[PDB]
PDB file of C-alpha atoms (C1' of nucleotides) and ligand atoms in Angstrom:
ATOM      1  CA  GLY A   1       0.000   0.000   0.000  1.00  0.00           C
ATOM      2  CA  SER A   2       2.209   2.892  -1.320  1.00  0.00           C
ATOM      3  CA  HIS A   3       1.697   6.670  -0.931  1.00  0.00           C
ATOM      4  CA  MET A   4       2.189   6.839  -4.756  1.00  0.00           C
ATOM      5  CA  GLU A   5      -0.887   4.626  -5.365  1.00  0.00           C
ATOM      6  CA  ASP A   6      -3.167   6.711  -3.042  1.00  0.00           C
ATOM      7  CA  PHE A   7      -1.702   9.930  -4.604  1.00  0.00           C
ATOM      8  CA  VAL A   8      -2.532   8.715  -8.154  1.00  0.00           C
ATOM      9  CA  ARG A   9      -6.158   7.842  -7.201  1.00  0.00           C
ATOM     10  CA  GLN A  10      -6.874  11.330  -5.729  1.00  0.00           C
ATOM     11  CA  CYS A  11      -4.824  13.205  -8.481  1.00  0.00           C
ATOM     12  CA  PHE A  12      -6.636  11.773 -11.606  1.00  0.00           C
ATOM     13  CA  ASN A  13     -10.391  11.499 -12.283  1.00  0.00           C
ATOM     14  CA  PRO A  14     -11.883   7.983 -11.777  1.00  0.00           C
ATOM     15  CA  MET A  15     -12.416   7.403 -15.557  1.00  0.00           C
ATOM     16  CA  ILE A  16      -8.630   7.919 -16.216  1.00  0.00           C
ATOM     17  CA  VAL A  17      -7.730   5.761 -13.171  1.00  0.00           C
ATOM     18  CA  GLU A  18     -10.058   2.890 -14.454  1.00  0.00           C
ATOM     19  CA  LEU A  19      -8.552   3.063 -18.027  1.00  0.00           C
ATOM     20  CA  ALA A  20      -4.987   3.023 -16.516  1.00  0.00           C
ATOM     21  CA  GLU A  21      -5.819  -0.001 -14.252  1.00  0.00           C
ATOM     22  CA  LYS A  22      -7.300  -1.867 -17.293  1.00  0.00           C
ATOM     23  CA  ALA A  23      -4.184  -1.031 -19.469  1.00  0.00           C
ATOM     24  CA  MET A  24      -1.735  -2.490 -16.855  1.00  0.00           C
ATOM     25  CA  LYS A  25      -4.014  -5.561 -16.275  1.00  0.00           C
ATOM     26  CA  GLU A  26      -4.611  -6.018 -20.100  1.00  0.00           C
ATOM     27  CA  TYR A  27      -0.755  -6.605 -20.063  1.00  0.00           C
ATOM     28  CA  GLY A  28      -0.913  -8.618 -16.767  1.00  0.00           C
ATOM     29  CA  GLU A  29       0.655  -5.946 -14.437  1.00  0.00           C
ATOM     30  CA  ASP A  30      -0.159  -4.556 -10.937  1.00  0.00           C
ATOM     31  CA  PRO A  31      -0.949  -0.829 -10.225  1.00  0.00           C
ATOM     32  CA  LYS A  32      -0.243  -1.629  -6.487  1.00  0.00           C
ATOM     33  CA  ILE A  33       3.400  -2.745  -7.274  1.00  0.00           C
ATOM     34  CA  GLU A  34       4.331  -0.815 -10.484  1.00  0.00           C
ATOM     35  CA  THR A  35       3.143   2.545  -8.994  1.00  0.00           C
ATOM     36  CA  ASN A  36       5.504   4.720 -11.145  1.00  0.00           C
ATOM     37  CA  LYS A  37       4.127   3.005 -14.303  1.00  0.00           C
ATOM     38  CA  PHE A  38       0.591   3.618 -12.901  1.00  0.00           C
ATOM     39  CA  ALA A  39       1.278   7.384 -12.534  1.00  0.00           C
ATOM     40  CA  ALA A  40       2.928   7.612 -16.019  1.00  0.00           C
ATOM     41  CA  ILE A  41      -0.017   5.813 -17.733  1.00  0.00           C
ATOM     42  CA  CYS A  42      -2.578   8.067 -15.954  1.00  0.00           C
ATOM     43  CA  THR A  43      -0.484  11.148 -16.985  1.00  0.00           C
ATOM     44  CA  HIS A  44      -0.313   9.947 -20.660  1.00  0.00           C
ATOM     45  CA  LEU A  45      -4.129   9.323 -20.732  1.00  0.00           C
ATOM     46  CA  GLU A  46      -4.949  12.762 -19.192  1.00  0.00           C
ATOM     47  CA  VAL A  47      -2.669  14.608 -21.726  1.00  0.00           C
ATOM     48  CA  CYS A  48      -4.170  12.660 -24.717  1.00  0.00           C
ATOM     49  CA  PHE A  49      -7.746  13.574 -23.603  1.00  0.00           C
ATOM     50  CA  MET A  50      -6.780  17.277 -22.885  1.00  0.00           C
ATOM     51  CA  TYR A  51      -5.112  17.330 -26.343  1.00  0.00           C
ATOM     52  CA  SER A  52      -8.217  15.896 -28.153  1.00  0.00           C
ATOM     53  CA  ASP A  53     -10.399  18.599 -26.367  1.00  0.00           C
ATOM     54  CA  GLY A  54      -8.172  21.323 -28.012  1.00  0.00           C
ATOM     55  CA  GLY A  55      -9.422  20.842 -31.597  1.00  0.00           C
ATOM     56  CA  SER A  56     -12.581  21.810 -33.503  1.00  0.00           C
ATOM     57  CA  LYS A  57     -15.371  19.272 -32.651  1.00  0.00           C
ATOM     58  CA  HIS A  58     -14.727  16.415 -35.208  1.00  0.00           C
ATOM     59  CA  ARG A  59     -10.970  17.010 -35.583  1.00  0.00           C
ATOM     60  CA  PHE A  60      -9.488  13.926 -33.863  1.00  0.00           C
ATOM     61  CA  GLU A  61     -10.258  10.221 -33.690  1.00  0.00           C
ATOM     62  CA  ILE A  62      -9.275   9.163 -30.162  1.00  0.00           C
ATOM     63  CA  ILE A  63      -7.214   5.875 -30.208  1.00  0.00           C
ATOM     64  CA  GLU A  64      -5.663   6.041 -26.686  1.00  0.00           C
ATOM     65  CA  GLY A  65      -8.075   4.776 -23.975  1.00  0.00           C
ATOM     66  CA  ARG A  66      -9.714   2.034 -26.146  1.00  0.00           C
ATOM     67  CA  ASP A  67      -9.219  -1.767 -25.760  1.00  0.00           C
ATOM     68  CA  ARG A  68      -6.129  -2.737 -27.909  1.00  0.00           C
ATOM     69  CA  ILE A  69      -8.249  -4.844 -30.350  1.00  0.00           C
ATOM     70  CA  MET A  70     -10.748  -1.995 -30.889  1.00  0.00           C
ATOM     71  CA  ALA A  71      -7.814   0.527 -31.091  1.00  0.00           C
ATOM     72  CA  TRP A  72      -6.198  -1.433 -34.023  1.00  0.00           C
ATOM     73  CA  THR A  73      -9.679  -1.886 -35.622  1.00  0.00           C
ATOM     74  CA  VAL A  74     -10.184   1.930 -35.629  1.00  0.00           C
ATOM     75  CA  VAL A  75      -6.580   2.425 -36.908  1.00  0.00           C
ATOM     76  CA  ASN A  76      -7.317  -0.011 -39.797  1.00  0.00           C
ATOM     77  CA  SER A  77     -10.578   1.823 -40.620  1.00  0.00           C
ATOM     78  CA  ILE A  78      -8.617   5.133 -40.850  1.00  0.00           C
ATOM     79  CA  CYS A  79      -5.768   3.605 -42.971  1.00  0.00           C
ATOM     80  CA  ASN A  80      -8.276   1.819 -45.268  1.00  0.00           C
ATOM     81  CA  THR A  81     -10.408   4.962 -45.768  1.00  0.00           C
ATOM     82  CA  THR A  82      -7.626   7.632 -45.991  1.00  0.00           C
ATOM     83  CA  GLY A  83      -4.889   5.395 -47.563  1.00  0.00           C
ATOM     84  CA  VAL A  84      -2.427   6.717 -44.863  1.00  0.00           C
ATOM     85  CA  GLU A  85       0.348   4.186 -43.934  1.00  0.00           C
ATOM     86  CA  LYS A  86      -0.576   1.677 -41.145  1.00  0.00           C
ATOM     87  CA  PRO A  87       1.640   2.627 -38.123  1.00  0.00           C
ATOM     88  CA  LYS A  88       3.764  -0.151 -36.491  1.00  0.00           C
ATOM     89  CA  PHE A  89       2.926   0.987 -32.910  1.00  0.00           C
ATOM     90  CA  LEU A  90      -0.519   2.086 -31.682  1.00  0.00           C
ATOM     91  CA  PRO A  91      -0.773   5.899 -32.025  1.00  0.00           C
ATOM     92  CA  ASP A  92      -2.825   8.134 -29.607  1.00  0.00           C
ATOM     93  CA  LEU A  93      -4.979  10.230 -31.990  1.00  0.00           C
ATOM     94  CA  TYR A  94      -5.706  10.623 -35.703  1.00  0.00           C
ATOM     95  CA  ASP A  95      -5.843  14.229 -36.933  1.00  0.00           C
ATOM     96  CA  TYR A  96      -8.600  14.451 -39.598  1.00  0.00           C
ATOM     97  CA  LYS A  97      -7.545  18.077 -40.392  1.00  0.00           C
ATOM     98  CA  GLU A  98      -3.837  17.340 -41.074  1.00  0.00           C
ATOM     99  CA  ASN A  99      -4.473  13.629 -42.038  1.00  0.00           C
ATOM    100  CA  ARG A 100      -1.878  12.070 -39.706  1.00  0.00           C
ATOM    101  CA  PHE A 101      -1.604   9.871 -36.568  1.00  0.00           C
ATOM    102  CA  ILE A 102      -0.192  11.551 -33.440  1.00  0.00           C
ATOM    103  CA  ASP A 103       1.899   9.853 -30.735  1.00  0.00           C
ATOM    104  CA  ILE A 104       1.961  12.012 -27.574  1.00  0.00           C
ATOM    105  CA  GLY A 105       4.615  11.494 -24.900  1.00  0.00           C
ATOM    106  CA  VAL A 106       5.348  13.044 -21.504  1.00  0.00           C
ATOM    107  CA  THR A 107       8.906  13.140 -20.170  1.00  0.00           C
ATOM    108  CA  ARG A 108      10.790  14.207 -16.999  1.00  0.00           C
ATOM    109  CA  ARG A 109      14.079  14.262 -19.084  1.00  0.00           C
ATOM    110  CA  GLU A 110      14.974  16.943 -21.713  1.00  0.00           C
ATOM    111  CA  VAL A 111      12.189  16.883 -24.365  1.00  0.00           C
ATOM    112  CA  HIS A 112      14.522  15.968 -27.234  1.00  0.00           C
ATOM    113  CA  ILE A 113      15.742  12.756 -25.495  1.00  0.00           C
ATOM    114  CA  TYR A 114      12.285  11.095 -25.557  1.00  0.00           C
ATOM    115  CA  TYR A 115      11.483  12.745 -28.949  1.00  0.00           C
ATOM    116  CA  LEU A 116      14.553  11.043 -30.581  1.00  0.00           C
ATOM    117  CA  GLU A 117      13.892   7.691 -28.798  1.00  0.00           C
ATOM    118  CA  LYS A 118      10.295   7.827 -30.160  1.00  0.00           C
ATOM    119  CA  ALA A 119      11.450   9.079 -33.598  1.00  0.00           C
ATOM    120  CA  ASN A 120      13.301   5.693 -33.951  1.00  0.00           C
ATOM    121  CA  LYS A 121      11.613   3.115 -31.611  1.00  0.00           C
ATOM    122  CA  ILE A 122       8.384   3.791 -33.596  1.00  0.00           C
ATOM    123  CA  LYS A 123      10.226   4.293 -37.013  1.00  0.00           C
ATOM    124  CA  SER A 124       6.827   4.314 -38.991  1.00  0.00           C
ATOM    125  CA  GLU A 125       7.889   7.681 -40.604  1.00  0.00           C
ATOM    126  CA  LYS A 126       4.517   9.463 -41.245  1.00  0.00           C
ATOM    127  CA  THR A 127       3.369   9.461 -37.492  1.00  0.00           C
ATOM    128  CA  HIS A 128       3.495  12.974 -35.887  1.00  0.00           C
ATOM    129  CA  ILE A 129       5.316  13.059 -32.493  1.00  0.00           C
ATOM    130  CA  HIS A 130       4.423  15.635 -29.835  1.00  0.00           C
ATOM    131  CA  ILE A 131       6.445  15.504 -26.538  1.00  0.00           C
ATOM    132  CA  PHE A 132       5.586  17.538 -23.370  1.00  0.00           C
ATOM    133  CA  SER A 133       7.935  17.902 -20.352  1.00  0.00           C
ATOM    134  CA  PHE A 134       7.045  18.519 -16.658  1.00  0.00           C
ATOM    135  CA  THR A 135       8.939  21.875 -16.995  1.00  0.00           C
ATOM    136  CA  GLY A 136       6.735  23.427 -19.725  1.00  0.00           C
ATOM    137  CA  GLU A 137       8.755  22.523 -22.876  1.00  0.00           C
ATOM    138  CA  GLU A 138       7.248  20.755 -25.924  1.00  0.00           C
ATOM    139  CA  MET A 139       8.746  19.388 -29.114  1.00  0.00           C
ATOM    140  CA  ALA A 140       6.788  18.232 -32.207  1.00  0.00           C
ATOM    141  CA  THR A 141       7.624  16.856 -35.690  1.00  0.00           C
ATOM    142  CA  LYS A 142       8.499  19.738 -38.134  1.00  0.00           C
ATOM    143  CA  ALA A 143       7.866  22.289 -35.336  1.00  0.00           C
ATOM    144  CA  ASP A 144       4.136  21.741 -36.208  1.00  0.00           C
ATOM    145  CA  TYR A 145       2.428  21.843 -32.770  1.00  0.00           C
ATOM    146  CA  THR A 146      -1.078  20.991 -34.165  1.00  0.00           C
ATOM    147  CA  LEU A 147      -3.219  22.977 -31.572  1.00  0.00           C
ATOM    148  CA  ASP A 148      -3.578  26.707 -30.643  1.00  0.00           C
ATOM    149  CA  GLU A 149      -1.034  27.921 -28.004  1.00  0.00           C
ATOM    150  CA  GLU A 150      -3.777  28.170 -25.273  1.00  0.00           C
ATOM    151  CA  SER A 151      -4.630  24.394 -25.627  1.00  0.00           C
ATOM    152  CA  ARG A 152      -0.934  23.425 -25.266  1.00  0.00           C
ATOM    153  CA  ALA A 153      -0.398  25.970 -22.453  1.00  0.00           C
ATOM    154  CA  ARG A 154      -3.177  24.405 -20.254  1.00  0.00           C
ATOM    155  CA  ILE A 155      -1.519  20.962 -20.735  1.00  0.00           C
ATOM    156  CA  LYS A 156       1.842  22.337 -19.663  1.00  0.00           C
ATOM    157  CA  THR A 157       0.206  24.013 -16.631  1.00  0.00           C
ATOM    158  CA  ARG A 158      -1.492  20.733 -15.580  1.00  0.00           C
ATOM    159  CA  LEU A 159       1.818  18.765 -15.898  1.00  0.00           C
ATOM    160  CA  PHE A 160       3.675  21.300 -13.664  1.00  0.00           C
ATOM    161  CA  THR A 161       0.766  20.958 -11.153  1.00  0.00           C
ATOM    162  CA  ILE A 162       1.173  17.107 -11.127  1.00  0.00           C
ATOM    163  CA  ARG A 163       4.914  17.705 -10.579  1.00  0.00           C
ATOM    164  CA  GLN A 164       4.359  20.094  -7.583  1.00  0.00           C
ATOM    165  CA  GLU A 165       1.715  17.687  -6.053  1.00  0.00           C
ATOM    166  CA  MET A 166       4.231  14.743  -6.266  1.00  0.00           C
ATOM    167  CA  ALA A 167       7.091  16.961  -4.900  1.00  0.00           C
ATOM    168  CA  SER A 168       5.033  18.270  -1.937  1.00  0.00           C
ATOM    169  CA  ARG A 169       4.513  14.528  -1.036  1.00  0.00           C
ATOM    170  CA  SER A 170       8.229  13.512  -1.535  1.00  0.00           C
ATOM    171  CA  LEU A 171       7.175  11.267  -4.465  1.00  0.00           C
ATOM    172  CA  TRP A 172       8.820  13.411  -7.244  1.00  0.00           C
ATOM    173  CA  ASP A 173      12.505  12.303  -6.744  1.00  0.00           C
ATOM    174  CA  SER A 174      11.452   8.600  -6.760  1.00  0.00           C
ATOM    175  CA  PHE A 175       9.186   9.313  -9.880  1.00  0.00           C
ATOM    176  CA  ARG A 176      11.749  11.578 -11.771  1.00  0.00           C
ATOM    177  CA  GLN A 177      14.564   9.004 -10.946  1.00  0.00           C
ATOM    178  CA  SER A 178      12.530   5.836 -11.994  1.00  0.00           C
TER     179      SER A 178
ATOM    180  C1'  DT B   1       1.719  -0.372 -23.657  1.00  0.00           C
ATOM    181  C1'  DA B   2       4.312   4.582 -20.362  1.00  0.00           C
ATOM    182  C1'  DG B   3       8.866   6.070 -20.580  1.00  0.00           C
ATOM    183  C1'  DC B   4      13.361   5.838 -18.001  1.00  0.00           C
ATOM    184  C1'  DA B   5      17.050   2.449 -18.043  1.00  0.00           C
ATOM    185  C1'  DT B   6      20.757   0.367 -20.833  1.00  0.00           C
TER     186       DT B   6
HETATM  187 MN1   MN C 201       1.947   8.152 -26.695  1.00  0.00          MN
END
DNA sequence: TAGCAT
């Protein structure tokens, strides 16, 4: 029974917490033990949903948050109807305005470190990468940041708030260093 | 699978 687990459950809304729990269990893993992975998955979900709220109403197909089988089904429907390349790893959103998949990532390292790791470990060229840090930096493919500044700014604000909440509980050093 | 580790 870790502090980190009880922190996560009062920091994120129940719908995000339930989707996180399902994602770790769908891959046979324990929120109670892998508490840093629990917090990261909740963080990734919250950013993806905040990001999809930033568009015009029909702009994005949400992939993140669905059962894996249904996620790939929706990816195949997009690739078959748009002709866009089928990504190798499950993306987070599909941008109907710019006709591309987006993979969002959140990092406690310098933004470019995770960006470059993603820009290889995913290879599948045409997928747009958008990285956010817990210090208010972002980095996106071709410096194309997809949303208005206000929509990205509220994401950066929320991430710094998660950081301060973890730090005020002495969970940040453990989280940052794991 | 998240993303930090290696
Ligand atoms: Mn992602």
